[model samples]
Target: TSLCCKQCQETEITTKNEIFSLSLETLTVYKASNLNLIGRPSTVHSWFPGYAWTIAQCKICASHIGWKFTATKKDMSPQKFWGLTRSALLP
Candidate 1:
């Protein structure tokens, strides 16, 4: 039940969760009910105040897709606090 590709060989019957978990692990760091991956600016949100962030990789490749930061309080949205702060790719 294996399939061959241009540069890889594997079975096509792979489960969704299997791939998802694999990718999740590669991107995120979940431990003791806490998730911390890359692109974390401040340590204040590291499993503190009942908050955590789950990072995920891109769907097409192993790129840093983004993170889901959970907030306990009503006024603790990560996006709100962090805002959209990033330079453009092109000059």
Candidate 2:
């Protein structure tokens, strides 16, 4: 099975995400070519410090997968990443 959007079965990170207890619970995807940001990035209530998050969805179907995070602080590494909920993954 593959990690994909539940709504339209659009593919995402194939291998799998960096599983972790992020926020309400999510897995971190370092490279998500199939995702699209819907709104402005925000720092409010961020689970990861110095990282701003933006709403992320399936580029094909606009399914709400989770949020995309970007390092706002110059010190943080991995510039950007994605956090997707298990429920949204068809894996």
Candidate 3:
């Protein structure tokens, strides 16, 4: 199945490529630049000192879409990615 933003329906976010099916938890990762994120991402310390998580939203409707994870270490390679909510998409 394909997924798109429920509000505008103009932004075709992702296809079935990296889509994951889950019960109580629903999360999907997409390209960081692919989403039209609004404002600055809220920071959250997760897992380790170098790792951080930030929440993202849709630019058009301001809907909470997903989160981005990145590495804060200078020497270490960046683990940059996004995890979108399945509830934020339209079936």
Candidate 4:
């Protein structure tokens, strides 16, 4: 089953679109998609180094979903990506 927002189930992202980070903590997140973002993007304690992150939420219900990551440096690849928490998603 495809991943749906656990709260509103209105946004959809494919399960196969997972993005792995180089952070010390093990993280499993989906690449950016239909999810919405809030808060200013910050680089402090970012899960993915070289990228700033903002809070990601469901567009309909505004439920916490994940983080929207944007590359802080022009040299970084994948200029922008979304990291949808696995626990906040449903199949």
Candidate 5:
């Protein structure tokens, strides 16, 4: 099956990995995307000391979509990834 934005039914976003659960504060992320995201940054914050997270939303509906995490450590090679929640998508 494929996933899509629940608000606008956009097919630009989809997931291939088994959905997993992660929690932070009051939010529970029920899905994730290792790749395949079609959105832009809405906000950026530092969750970890040297790591930054940028919130991404659907380009069509502007729904709170996912995030991009980037490592800012100088010693470590640059690394980044995207994580989208199932709350923003449907099968």
Candidate 6:
């Protein structure tokens, strides 16, 4: 007999982004159009804040695995750069 507990991690965007999956063209247009200055557009915007960034998820699990955001405010501290590790050895 086998038991399976379906579990997976997910990602979620807290902010209401004007860009929805921003491509190169969309990102350029977004800044050039000054969507933020005039007020946030109702239309969805992309996550690309430059450097051609984008966010994606797993279709099967709908998990928000990774994202591309502005690096200007990011920190390189251990707390921010840490990773999860698992050990196969169990006594």
Q: Which candidate is the best by lDDT?
A: 2
TM-score for each candidate, following the candidate numbering? 0.28, 0.81, 0.61, 0.76, 0.56, 0.21
- Pairs that collide in candidate 6 are 11-64, 18-45, 19-45, 19-46, 20-44, 20-45, 20-46, 21-46, 22-46
Question: What is the number of backbone collisions in each predicted candidate, taken in the order shown?
Answer: 0, 0, 0, 1, 0, 9
Q: Please give the CA lDDT of all the candidate structures.
A: 0.29, 0.76, 0.61, 0.71, 0.55, 0.23
Which whole-number lDDT from 0 to 100 does residue 35 have in model 3? 63
**lDDT per residue (tens digit) for residues 1-91 in model 5:** 6677788885445555534333232122334443334444333555444556677677677787676655576674334555666677776
Off by over 4 Å in 2: 17-24
Model 4 ranges with Cα > 4 A deviation: 18-31
Candidate whose TM-score is highest:
2
lDDT string for model 3 (2-56, tens) is 6777777877666767554322134545353346555454455453346566767
The worst-scoring run of ten residues by lDDT in candidate 2 lies at: 14-23
Range of the 10 consecutive residues with the lowest summed lDDT in candidate 6: 82-91
Model with the higher lDDT, candidate 2 or 5: 2
| Greater-TM-score candidate between 2 and 3 | 2
lDDT of 6 by residue, 1-91 (tens): 1111122322222222322332321121111110111122221352423232234333335433333333333442111110011110011
What's the lDDT for residue 83 in model 5? Answer: 62
lDDT of 5: 0.55
RMSD of 6: 16.9
Total clashes in model 1, counting residue pairs 3 or more apart in sequence or in different chains: 0
